Enzyme design. Sequence first.
Site, mmCIF file in Angstrom:
data_model
loop_
_atom_site.group_PDB
_atom_site.id
_atom_site.type_symbol
_atom_site.label_atom_id
_atom_site.label_comp_id
_atom_site.label_asym_id
_atom_site.label_seq_id
_atom_site.Cartn_x
_atom_site.Cartn_y
_atom_site.Cartn_z
ATOM 1 N N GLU A 169 0.188 21.884 3.305
ATOM 2 C CA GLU A 169 0.533 22.679 2.130
ATOM 3 C C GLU A 169 0.708 21.797 0.911
ATOM 4 O O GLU A 169 1.298 20.754 1.029
ATOM 5 C CB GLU A 169 1.819 23.423 2.420
ATOM 6 C CG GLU A 169 1.908 24.713 1.665
ATOM 7 C CD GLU A 169 3.068 24.745 0.694
ATOM 8 O OE1 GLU A 169 3.867 25.712 0.767
ATOM 9 O OE2 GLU A 169 3.202 23.794 -0.121
ATOM 10 N N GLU A 219 5.833 25.040 -8.045
ATOM 11 C CA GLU A 219 6.884 26.083 -8.163
ATOM 12 C C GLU A 219 7.449 26.028 -9.578
ATOM 13 O O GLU A 219 7.912 24.976 -9.969
ATOM 14 C CB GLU A 219 8.007 25.870 -7.151
ATOM 15 C CG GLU A 219 7.536 25.733 -5.714
ATOM 16 C CD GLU A 219 6.945 27.008 -5.133
ATOM 17 O OE1 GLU A 219 7.466 28.095 -5.412
ATOM 18 O OE2 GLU A 219 5.939 26.914 -4.425
#
Length: 243
Positions: A96, A100
């Site tokens: 991943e 954010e």
Amino acid sequence: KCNPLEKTCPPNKGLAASTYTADFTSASALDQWEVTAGKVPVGPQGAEFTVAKQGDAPTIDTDFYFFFGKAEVVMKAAPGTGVVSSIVLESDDLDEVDWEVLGGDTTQVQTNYFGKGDTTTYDRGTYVPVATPQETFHTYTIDWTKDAVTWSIDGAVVRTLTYNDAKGGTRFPQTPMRLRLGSWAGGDPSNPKGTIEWAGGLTDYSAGPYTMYVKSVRIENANPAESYTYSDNSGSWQSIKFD
């Protein structure tokens, strides 16, 4: 959700092209995407990810996976305390790479990565300065090669993860990944205290709604294929079979 580290899984659908581009001005642009939670309207500012009430987590995933290359997203983050705006590259073994944005943090974006779903340390997260990500669009770019993951904002490198940096390559993202876009309340009262603190506080849904906008997506697939197969339990890029 079939983990190739644990089982034999069916192949990932591949992006059988070197380039994918979506201008989210058009209703059409959601063709190769799954609205995988909530509803994602496509207005004149592109795909809209609105957090209006508790449980609102509007998300889109690419139908396809790409195996090395580039993900470039033009996004204006949702404002609001505890509201998270997420750009995620994610594999079926939970490799991943992500961006954010937090609604109440108007000066930074967080960069992050996981190898094989391993959340053991927090050497994975770095904050980088960005001008008012909730008030203006930026280009969030992830360059992904077998040597390094590079994060860029508006064509300026903000972070490099080298293969050796990621626990000697054992935790380097290196399996076919899909692109997930979404907003959600990190500050949902039902979340762990740790998530709420990270999100920057409790989300006040009534003071909403909070909308993240994605106006465009560019994916470059280094290894175009109709599909990808994990040939073993290694989770290594070397284990990925494709025609």
